[PDB]
Amino acid sequence: FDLNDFLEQKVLVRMEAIINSMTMKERAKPEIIKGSRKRRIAAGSGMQVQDVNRLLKQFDDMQRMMKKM
RNA sequence: GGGGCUGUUUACCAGGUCAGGUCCGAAAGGAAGCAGCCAAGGCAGCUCC
């Protein structure tokens, strides 16, 4: 379960935008997304870093709930 | 080394375009710009000077 999937699933538009600012690698293997990338991603989807963090936080919880069935 | 070809590779770090998103504006409209793609660079093979 990667960011490509979590994407399938008005505030959800802002979520898309954030994922649409990543690279194929960043989605497939999110854990490689540290400071520098976050910055690029935020500024890229007209967002702020915390919004990216929030998202990533969400995907995590979301993935977590997956690694439990 | 330079030209051409082909394969591969490259988040952001003054190329271009820029979906999505953002910014400014009452609006009409402007602005910056990630991914992508194009280009460009890297690692190589062929080839020409």
Swiss-Prot record:
Record localization: Cytoplasm
Effect of loss of the gene: Essential; deletion experiments lead to loss of inner membrane protein targeting. Also leads to reduced targeting of lipoproteins Lpp and BRP.
Recorded domain comment: Composed of three domains: the N-terminal N domain, which is responsible for interactions with the ribosome, the central G domain, which binds GTP, and the C-terminal M domain, which binds the RNA and the signal sequence of the RNC.
Membership in a protein family: Belongs to the GTP-binding SRP family. SRP54 subfamily.
Quaternary structure and interacting proteins, as annotated: Part of the signal recognition particle protein translocation system, which is composed of SRP and FtsY. SRP is a ribonucleoprotein composed of Ffh and a 4.5S RNA molecule. Metal ions are essential for the formation and stability of the SRP complex. Interacts with the ribosomes, via ribosomal protein L23. Interacts with FtsY.
Function in brief: Involved in targeting and insertion of nascent membrane proteins into the cytoplasmic membrane. Binds to the hydrophobic signal sequence of the ribosome-nascent chain (RNC) as it emerges from the ribosomes. The SRP-RNC complex is then targeted to the cytoplasmic membrane where it interacts with the SRP receptor FtsY. Interaction with FtsY leads to the transfer of the RNC complex to the Sec translocase for insertion into the membrane, the hydrolysis of GTP by both Ffh and FtsY, and the dissociation of the SRP-FtsY complex into the individual components.
Name of the protein in question: Signal recognition particle protein
Annotated source species: Escherichia coli (strain K12)
